[PDB]
Subunit: 40 residues, 4 copies
């Protein structure tokens, strides 16, 4: 049978992966601002 | 103690704003798809 | 012959709303921080 | 110039990590949905 929302689920997943990459990028910017800390 | 530039918060908040827009987009398209499917 | 399961989409929508709640809370925390910055 | 405690930034990072967990869980749910649709 044809799953009527197949293309939609694929699109939602792709958007979520893009958003996940955005969060990774944010986390990376934060890590880069903290990376030179030797102690705390 | 360790500190960072306060303006980093504004960069973070800008990206989060965008994350929010992305989530809103996805919620909207799901609501639209559910409306279109008329089960009888 | 189609296969349709609206519960799958409702589940995804529920998770997206939960995500949006968390993201709104984080934005609020950063706005609070930026308010405090302005005052020194 | 204005400086914020590095710990405030580590806290934001912790919330971002929680957001990443949420997106991962949702991506996993969609992936599982799409596997299941193969058999209908």
């Amino acid at each position: 049978s044809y799953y009527i929302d197949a293309d939609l689920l694929r699109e939602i997943k792709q958007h979520l992966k893009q958003q996940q990459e955005g969060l990774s990028h944010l986390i990376s910017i934060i890590k880069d601002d903290l990376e030179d800390i030797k102690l705390v």
